[PDB]
Amino acid sequence: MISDIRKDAEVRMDKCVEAFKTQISKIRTGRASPSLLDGIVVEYYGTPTPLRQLASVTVEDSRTLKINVFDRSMSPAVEKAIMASDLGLNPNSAGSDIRVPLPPLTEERRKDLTKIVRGEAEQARVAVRNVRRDANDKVKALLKDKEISEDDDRRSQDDVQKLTDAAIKKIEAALADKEAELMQF
Numbered sequence: 001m002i003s004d005i006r007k008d009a010e011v012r013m014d015k016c017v018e019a020f021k022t023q024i025s026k027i028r029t030g031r032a033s034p035s036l037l038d039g040i041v042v043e044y045y046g047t048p049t050p051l052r053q054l055a056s057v058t059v060e061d062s063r064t065l066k067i068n069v070f071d072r073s074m075s076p077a078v079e080k081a082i083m084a085s086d087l088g089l090n091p092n093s094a095g096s097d098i099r100v101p102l103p104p105l106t107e108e109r110r111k112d113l114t115k116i117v118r119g120e121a122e123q124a125r126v127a128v129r130n131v132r133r134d135a136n137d138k139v140k141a142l143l144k145d146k147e148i149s150e151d152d153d154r155r156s157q158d159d160v161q162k163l164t165d166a167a168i169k170k171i172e173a174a175l176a177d178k179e180a181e182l183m184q185f
């Protein structure tokens with residue numbers, strides 16, 4: 001019946017938007033990660049050792065790392081090791097903690113990612129319009145032989161169109177926030 005069909009359509013459209021929302025949250029928009037500097041070699045009592053074994057690296061923010069050295073006497077050496085890796089990283093030392101601001105993703109990268117979210121959004125929009133269509137079908141078709149008539153078709157078609165509108169609207173909002181994120185730093 002028509003009671004089923006439309007509630008069936010929005011459950012379908014919801015799944016689409018939600019798949020898009022999860023597919024997109026995977027995309028990182030900044031360089032920040034707790035293991036980003038794990039590979040930096042530090043002079044530790046003669047022996048070169050990866051930074052990972054000498055300090056805790058926490059993500060203070062999307063483009064900044066906070067390095068927590070376990071042995072305070074090693075901080076100076078860690079700071080030199082960071083400058084020395086020649087990654088363009090300007091370590092900012094201050095009070096038992098070293099902070100590491102990070103360069104933004106490259107122009108080329110942002111474009112590769114903008115392109116990916118747009119394609120996924122696009123996919124989400126086609127999926128949503130296919131569900132709309134499948135609904136319209138049942139409705140318009142049921143009009144042929146079984147019980148529904150023009151004014152129930154109209155309303156039903158319009159109620160469905162609006163479901164499509166709200167579903168398309170969520171995808172657009174998820175997309176915009178993501179590009180705003182990408183374009184952020």
Ligand SMILES: CCCCCCCCCCOCO
Binds near residue numbers: 036037087088103
């Ligand atoms: C894993 C540690 C990464 C540090 C990244 C600094 C930014 C490098 C950008 C690369 O551009 C080409 O040289």
Ligand SMILES: [Hg+2]
Binds near residue numbers: 015016017019124127
């Ligand atoms: Hg989808």
Ligand SMILES: [Hg+2]
Binds near residue numbers: 055070072074
């Ligand atoms: Hg240490």
Ligand SMILES: [Hg+2]
Binds near residue numbers: 053054070
């Ligand atoms: Hg250690």
